[PDB]
Structure 1
Amino acid sequence: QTLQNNAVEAVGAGSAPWSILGPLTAIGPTAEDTMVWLQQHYGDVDVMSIMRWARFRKGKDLMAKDRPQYLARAAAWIELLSKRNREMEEVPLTYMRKSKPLVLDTNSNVRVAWQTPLMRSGGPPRLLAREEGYVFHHSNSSRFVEETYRHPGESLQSRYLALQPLHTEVSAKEDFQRLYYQAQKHHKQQE
């Protein structure tokens, strides 16, 4: 349910491909397979000691009287104390793109963003991003852009000007789940 809510909220409510294949495997039909699954998916904590501690609540035996309350309490305690459960229940974030400074320096906050070939199809295959000069640069007033120049014609402007920086604003992130959802919607709602 948590993974389905994460895949729903990654798009904004349809589902994302985030909840197609999660990090939990299916449980075997054996109590020994249950102990195997709890030891290999929540093995950073002692599961049996947590379930023994979560049995009583203010003297009341929850395990013999209120069964779904005890199951919810033990599941919450296991999900709290386990670090691997905390690392496997994370919300999908957008992809932070690198950026380089402008060639014609207009602002120190305006930067040329590094674009994934998933975002823009075609073009040449690129090298690694750091070699051209793309690093992590972001602040409170940072703006990211694609930088070209207006094409000079045979006219009065030849060399006195610095070939004015025609800009086109791009985003600071790549929401991969929303791109996959919109591509599947274009593969589905068009058909």
Structure 2
Amino acid sequence: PAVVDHDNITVEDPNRVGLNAATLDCRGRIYRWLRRGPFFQVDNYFRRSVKLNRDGTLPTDFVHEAPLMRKIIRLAHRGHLKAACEEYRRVTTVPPVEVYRALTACCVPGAKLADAVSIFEDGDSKLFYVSRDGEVLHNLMRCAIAARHRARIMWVYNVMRGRFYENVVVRAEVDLIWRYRIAMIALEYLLDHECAEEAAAIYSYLVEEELLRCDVHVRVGLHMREAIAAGKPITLNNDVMNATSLVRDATAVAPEVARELQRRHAQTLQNNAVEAVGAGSAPWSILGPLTAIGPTAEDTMVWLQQHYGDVDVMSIMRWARFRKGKDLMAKDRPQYLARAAAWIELLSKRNREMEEVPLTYMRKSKPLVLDTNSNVRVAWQTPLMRSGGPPRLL
């Protein structure tokens, strides 16, 4: 099989790789050349070199091109995006994942979404999915956040869950911890801007992957790292997890959250009942679906459990803690309260069912006995609307 030396090319052509016009046996070759696909030269040059290693290792590390990648990264870090791309163009071999991490991370501050997305899309399926990574994805999601693009948040998330092809066949799939983080800033955003649907989707995925308790697992994981550093034994127990400051603090705030839920709900009931009449008080607010809380800690956890208990409330109170690096529980109490309240309100189907507005009751009808219009119908009338009238069936 022919191979082209790009160093050694001579007029003499020792290897006999060139296409000769007049030699014996040249004909079918010449035809073969004129029959070639549109990308033939380029595609074959690209695939004959640049292929996945027998190990499962990317081609990504090559000596001659390394200083270039160093330059790209170093440029992206000082925040020159265009410069970095102008050098990206000059790259002959697949660049390492670090390149893409740098480029997208550079893309985040200025909010450019489109360029980040096209970077990542350049790394997917073209280049063997060097660009499928936790960190890169993470940057993409944070970009979608900056630019307030809902559909693109969902798009990024959808990419990160991945497909049978990229998951099983390629074996390029994001790390567990990273999936947690991405999904979590997405959920943060959605629940803050009151998007019920996509919040419900992402939350349902968290539920499904057993990721509800995860932040705890990471905290516990660091303490256990220092404990292995000192040489002591470590284990995963419920007592070890409920010893964490996170869990303890959440448990401490629980009754306050529940009281806030109660107040908010009561006042929503009030509003609905007043709008029902178009403004006194309607009967709608007299007795609502929420039961009064007993005066205790256990009564609180139980109450939350039975009324709001389709969601896991403890984990949501954990997530609602930090905002933009600021700790809400230890600085602003009421803001944290209204936030955990809002999030539990949004993520639960039960609360949604009980917070609804009273609607008027639709009349059934029969068509006229003497026809004039097809559009004019005889409406059924409830016993309430006509007192008197003969005794009638349903």
| 1:114 is aligned to 2:380 | yes
Q: CA RMSD in A?
A: 0.6
Greater fraction strand? 1
Q: Equivalences for 1:1-191 in 2 at 5 Å?
A: 1-128=267-394
Once residues 315 and 282 of structure 2 are traced to their aligned partners in structure 1, the CA distance between those partners, rounded to angstroms, is 37
Once residues 368 and 389 of structure 2 are traced to their aligned partners in structure 1, the CA distance between those partners, rounded to angstroms, is 21
Q: How many residues align?
A: 128
What is the TM-score with the length of structure 2 in the denominator?
0.32
Per-residue deviation, 1:124 = 2.3
Once residues 327 and 302 of structure 2 are traced to their aligned partners in structure 1, the CA distance between those partners, rounded to angstroms, is 27
Corresponding residue SS for 1:112? strand
In structure 1, the residue matched to 2:70 is none
Corresponding residue SS for 1:90? coil
Once residues 391 and 337 of structure 2 are traced to their aligned partners in structure 1, the CA distance between those partners, rounded to angstroms, is 53
Bigger relative contact order, structure 1 or 2, given CA contacts below 8 A and separation 6+?
1
Once residues 336 and 373 of structure 2 are traced to their aligned partners in structure 1, the CA distance between those partners, rounded to angstroms, is 59
Identity across the alignment (%): 100
Corresponding residue SS for 2:330? helix
Greater fraction helix? 2
Per-residue deviation, 1:13 = 1.3
Once residues 48 and 18 of structure 1 are traced to their aligned partners in structure 2, the CA distance between those partners, rounded to angstroms, is 31
Per-residue deviation, 1:122 = 1.5
Once residues 20 and 49 of structure 1 are traced to their aligned partners in structure 2, the CA distance between those partners, rounded to angstroms, is 33
Once residues 101 and 45 of structure 1 are traced to their aligned partners in structure 2, the CA distance between those partners, rounded to angstroms, is 47
Once residues 270 and 291 of structure 2 are traced to their aligned partners in structure 1, the CA distance between those partners, rounded to angstroms, is 15
Per-residue deviation, 1:125 = 2.1
After the TM superposition, list the runs of 4 or more consecutive aligned residues in structure 1 that deviate by more than 3 angstroms. Answer: none
In structure 1, the residue matched to 2:29 is none
What is the TM-score with the length of structure 1 in the denominator?
0.66
Give, as a single letter, the amino acid of the residue that structure 1 aligns with 2:334.
P
Structure 2 stretches lacking a partner, 5+ long: 1-266
Per-residue deviation, 1:126 = 1.3
Who wins on radius of gyration, i.e. which is larger?
Answer: 2
Structure 1 stretches lacking a partner, 5+ long: 129-191
Once residues 391 and 335 of structure 2 are traced to their aligned partners in structure 1, the CA distance between those partners, rounded to angstroms, is 56
Once residues 94 and 106 of structure 1 are traced to their aligned partners in structure 2, the CA distance between those partners, rounded to angstroms, is 28
